[model samples]
Target chain A: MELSFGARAELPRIHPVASKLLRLMQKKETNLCLSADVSLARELLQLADALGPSICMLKTHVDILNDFTLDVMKELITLAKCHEFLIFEDRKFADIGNTVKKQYEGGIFKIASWADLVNAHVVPGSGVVKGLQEVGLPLHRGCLLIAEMSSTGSLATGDYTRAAVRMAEEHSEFVVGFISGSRVSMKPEFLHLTPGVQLEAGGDNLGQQYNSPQEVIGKRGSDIIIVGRGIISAADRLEAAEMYRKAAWEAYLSRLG
Target chain B: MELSFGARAELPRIHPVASKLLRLMQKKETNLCLSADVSLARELLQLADALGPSICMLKTHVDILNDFTLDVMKELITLAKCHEFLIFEDRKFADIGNTVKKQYEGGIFKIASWADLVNAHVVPGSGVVKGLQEVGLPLHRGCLLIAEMSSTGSLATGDYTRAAVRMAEEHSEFVVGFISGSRVSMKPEFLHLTPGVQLEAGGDNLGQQYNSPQEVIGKRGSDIIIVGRGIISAADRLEAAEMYRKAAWEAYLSRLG
Candidate 1:
């Protein structure tokens, strides 16, 4: 299969949120997604401000904040707009349609209101995607299906990944891509974003398997490389963020050639 | 293979949380778990107060509350202690271990503080169970693994169910049971709680397949039947709760015989 790279604008029938994200990435010349998995609101805001300019996307776990409030979200949104990046909330929603609709739109976090992109697990079937679409599409937000995981002994097998692809294709209007370990779908419209990335190649004691940016983007065919502790845990986060951005962008360029 | 019923205390090495829950069910003479999927804090509190006497367990989606506050949880916890029931937060956590640790322990919801029971998805491998156990076990709380989902066309296949059972057994100290459609494990220590239960049999437009309380407990061997809208949406919620409690308890007695 011929892999499509850096041509997200040409993908047929792309969601507006995805189109905007791809455009932002191209303009910024970065495919690095910083996974800000910190637990405090102030730390999250500080990291976003310090490292925001180097990446095209910032992935968050909003529920992890101990002192979360509306003001925290407002500051984060302002930073995203000023930095020209999209915010992806890694909620990993897994529930029935009616329940997920309320979770997406009605929660205190009100994820659909701020998050440019959100993701869900396909364990609850395609209805989960449909449910999220009902709340997100109208708001111009995009969803990503978790097709595979980078953790050791993960239950997201090849069969699960194939089912996720079919589900995403059926809901193409809302499901812009997948949180996969590799390129699971051949469709150009469905972008693949892989996490568990780091500057060093190693595995954590808790089953997190790390890969270099080149390994994920160039060899694994992932469109976006999501780096968490690799950047967030760095002594100098800004320098680390720029380093990952350059490595992932060069990998994408090399893959295109 | 022999099946165990109404013998939670006799089960080998039961967690304190599981033991407490079982004793509560036996004392209340009800195996009905009320899934309060409502979106308002006041409604949740009202339901817990009104329906608290009939149910051994009250399942919640804390993140779904639009006007969530610490006071709401405080009141809910007080009611649970007053009514002698347990709270199950259906967060359906699915993430890496380090990330899930923060989500379970330090979040604005602070699930481990009040919730007697919590559930997690094993898609991120057994590490998720370990992470949740690290937090929940220290608080005398228990965790349930999602072995299977009740939604139509769910991707949680037989293979995935087997994996969940394995993961639960390996961490049986903190892992008390499963959120499954049927009894996934033959081990008496691992209780099975099935959701999507209604007084009548039918499904929703969003892929929720419902079964009668009799079918789930008497035939499927479920330890507890989780009824959501079936009881909460009724014109007379108290009457509906009482009906479901009677039906589920009778089914459990019949299964024992």
Candidate 2:
């Protein structure tokens, strides 16, 4: 079951970003993170604008836009402030230390310049994680390490996920949490963001299997449920998003009981 | 010892992109790759124009620019054709298959549109590697899997690196090889591109270590030695690239003997 807000407060060594994100989630009364994986800047902004207030974070694959610009990010930041949601760039940076820093801080997207949290693969080792810490610490940015993936043939299982969780704990300040499908014996200090979430679709032809928001929250104890097509793919995106949002929030409240 | 061109020829299967790259290397008599990690389009263009003719491939962290545009890649592609070198986009994509496809095909980068070779991490499972393959195969492009990193504290070793190698082989047609520090028993069909090659600097405060072209080529048996800063940061960028080019080719020839 998901930990209650009161329970999360008592956990020692909560990551600063995790604390901030949880506070926002509680204040907003929703733990929904909309995974906006669209390919148009205008559509991305529209989704953010329509569902921003209902979401705790707007998870973006910023590179998906056909014509990306700084203006897109600037507007998103503006929307984030207006809606009180965090920005999570799903960059999955997996490079050597120096290169990852450049990818994060430089680039057209300039993720480190605006994103509240980014995610990376531990495949590059602790050095790259440390590299991200150096880049993120001063900026009050945070990272979520990929501990386990929801895909069918994922390599991040067993010992691999265990080691990744260990790496995150060793650098709690910079690593706010883990992006996994389900719960592991991770420290409560670390937040869990679960993807592969859906209330309608079963699985994609490309091997992506979706779990219900209830499965992720009730069965897996994930702190945040990342719903993509369940909301964004719907005919009425804002309405679909609100449905998932309330479903996810009610699950959390029920779990807390 | 590195395999000679003759040995690589005897290998049962060869990736099309690898064959293209190796033919260019042998034709130019250089196995040196320059990673142009610059922050401006003009500087990146200048470096490529100056050294493109001397190297086998020009590796890039495309995101490391204050203002990135397709114009940069258009020029780089033109240089690659004029110089008979390949373009390696160093995007270590580590996301789900759906997201990876979007990042590769739909992003402003449009990596699938031009890059001869790109790289990714196997963290998200065979799905992401599969996702990248689906996008690149049709474009006649290929990807390198990051089996190991040259950074001091990288987590991509042991079983993790082995898992990446396995994933690469399963999709050998689309996966040209791996980005690794040392040689693994990868099928001779696959190429090994090792980073962290520097002649002057040993490492930076960022935990990146420099290995000589000889060590990576001779001792580790890497097929391609990826040299950054050492050449791009030199007093005469062209001369530095030529120097490394000669050094790397000689080392490969000696290893063949």
Candidate 3:
């Protein structure tokens, strides 16, 4: 089913399509997310060939592509749809007023023209999120905000963290998901994505530190545990992924009550 | 020239290709970025075909593609080269430490795998710029901070704005360019990206409240003028682009002296 997006300003309604997917996946012994990490444009197909069965959404950094405008991007979107993976924009937009409007409206990305969902930064503590919603995106296309990030020696403060949550709760109208870390509490209002997760093979050691799905789920109470190296870097990638997926499911089951 | 990424540091760099693009675009005219506004992905190609002569980079909001993804992005970059435009990931990534690293490495879009000059938010900043460089990327690849932005109701006060500048200059080892409007004074050390510049549309918009390339050149003096509707919404897009480009060049010439 097409990813559904809606205005959740009033009473919340669970998205039928997305809810169904969430439910079906729950029936299984594990929850899995496979990031394509496709660097080359054509590599997506190859990546799909390998990770199709394991991932729920096909994460794309379209900027890394060698040849995209509008036509090329659409082609890939069609492919993702056929593969039944949602298109998640890693773009974290952080502009205000007309600039953000223009970025969504007529800017080079022409986001309002086609995007299903996007990443936004509510730093200015202003109307940027409203502007993003004004573009007329559907529910799935609504947005996932980076309320407080999960990085090392990073600067997101506890104050900003609280405010981020407050704003997110107040304006559940546009946010279908919120991307934060296990370091904080999850908001029941939106879907959650926690990165900085890993199970093995060492994550990119230069800047980021790693953690396993088991650690986040067993300890942090994450609604969705986002793992990177934990699954991708393992010598037995498939086995690692299955193990992590099972751990996520077990946590969900334990917490369902 | 190769697309650039930065070298090793506190956060040792991981990739090599991103480093190349940075070196090539450093002093070159890759400053002017065009944001996409139209809905159709196809329009991007047409826009590129039309506006290629005036822009240095093409901006994208990937989630906008109703039918777009990684393969399309690769082609987009390829087209950028064909049109002499670099790909800027307006993905204002601001996740926590390793999460940001992992996201860039591949969750949605593999930025470590692609992107010429990437955009980042400095809100939750860390001393991670070196990580971008360590991978052999131009010291500015992988990401740039959303140090400041343009538009109405801004929160970046003079103090905040100035601090952002200071941090970007002294601490952001990878930041080669900074974005801010009259929101803050354009420091001599930073390259400016002035968005919100409106055009006359062959009449008085630029005359009334907006600044033409000539005016922005004389007044605000952005090294790179981000024109959204000013160019795309103009009666003649190519003609309007040329006007801004000429204005920017003239203003730049005088500012340099």
Candidate 4:
């Protein structure tokens, strides 16, 4: 069964299996990422089959699973782990310190027990960083600091950006390389994880603009490119994955140009 | 099933059963609420029973249900609705145009289809109004503005808070809340749902500090009192619920004080 938010977020870090996958992403060169923001495990597994060759990680929001179970999703995790993939559970948890503590400690995502890098927010007050200490998910656990977002005009504005960056810098241990948006300030050293990097695809009437993956890596200089529809919605996902991978590659090479 | 980031922010709002519960909170006598930041379905249901008579609305972060099936959670909604309790899915969704569009139209949350109100940020530059129009969730689906927070050194300070208040006032339907730290800038005309108001006995030691339920009712002058652990984590939850109800009633009566 796909673990609940509690089950997944509260997972212990360094679960022997998770430890191995992180090492693989580092050692392997083909480390692209795709956050599986899907509700069905079967469809996700199928999508993984088509795009697995190109990705190093598959982040999840497991609560969407209509048929989530440890058996099925764990099988998927087993497959990813076997294939040398890391799982990033996108739990943008914002709670009071002790509640977050218990959520990580006693709940399902008991991430304190088992996640590679769980998502967190800077809004709840700085003490959230310390409470994370009780759960023991230090930088090794991979806290993707919310630097800025890919959306057009966001609340995490100039002020939030500065505060988030300062927190990222000061609490470097609690955080790993964090996320900042390419739409604005692009701090390369912070380990840019840019999403909303669409390619050739126009905004769907609602304005989720897409740039070429080349630009995502080239202009944006993102370290991790998170693609959702860019992969899954493609007619042929494998082909789409390769096209995106190459675009990112060319963009990576473009730095010298 | 719990909703996701790329879709409507109100997956928990998909059931008609919940709207009925919300009506309870709008009642003139006791507009009492229990904002659930809990993880388990059983826990949510138990809290509902324990506080049934006392609480007007049972707000939830419905994503925490480990076995969240649309059917299962709908049952809980039906049950709560039967007893005049609303299910508020506190997904502070902050996605942009097309992505927010997809989040509304494409996902299981189908929140655009249902929900009395969904909490959203009135951050600068973001066309929250435009996005709301495109998603076309029901007109009744109000916006719960995070005007303030309970944390000690809340980041939402000074000019920004006033700016947020300015923007919130212009919207079609919005509830300006989380404004417990300072004076209630929003008068009775606004839907002020101030959380973090825990009667001394009801609040947990989580980072989200609380005012005594009496202090909250007496001092904050909040129309709705959002309680989380104050009811959920209590040894005698129902009694705690009754206590909160009495306090709210007495506070209303002594408003002149």
- Local distance difference test, per candidate? 0.88, 0.83, 0.55, 0.58
What is the DockQ (computed on Cα atoms) for candidate 1? 0.80
Q: Write the per-residue lDDT of candidate 2 for residues B1-257, one digit (tens) a residue.
A: 44665457456688777887877888889888899888888988888887888988988887887777788789888888998989988888877788888888877788888788888887667888778878888898989988888887677788878888888888887988889887775477788888889876588777788889888888788888898888777889889888888878888888888
Question: Could you tell which candidate, 2 or 3, scores higher by DockQ?
Answer: 2
DockQ of candidate 2 relative to the true structure: 0.70
lDDT string, candidate 4, A106-144, tens digits: 443344444566656666666565566556453356566
Docking class of 3: incorrect
By DockQ thresholds, what CAPRI class is model 1? high
- DockQ for each candidate? 0.80, 0.70, 0.15, 0.29
Candidate 3 scores an fnat of: 0.20
State the lDDT of candidate 2 residue by residue for A133-170, as single tens digits: 87899998999988888887787888878888888888
**Docking band of candidate 2:** medium
Alpha-carbon RMSD, each predicted model: 1.5, 2.3, 9.0, 8.6
The per-residue C-alpha lDDT of model 4 at residue A97 equals: 66
Instruction: Write the residue-wise lDDT of candidate 3 on A1-257 in tens digits.
Output: 11211221122454333453454354333345555444556665555555545555555545445444667567656765665555665656676544455556553456555555566776655467776766634533567667555554554556656666666666566666666665353434356666666765344554565666666655665556655556555576667666767777676556553
Residue A188, model 4, lDDT:
28
Highest-lDDT candidate: 1
Give candidate 4's root-mean-square deviation (CA, Å): 8.6
* True lDDT of residue B228, candidate 4: 69
Model 4 per-residue lDDT tens digits across residues B22-81: 345435245577776666667777777666667776676544454444665566666666
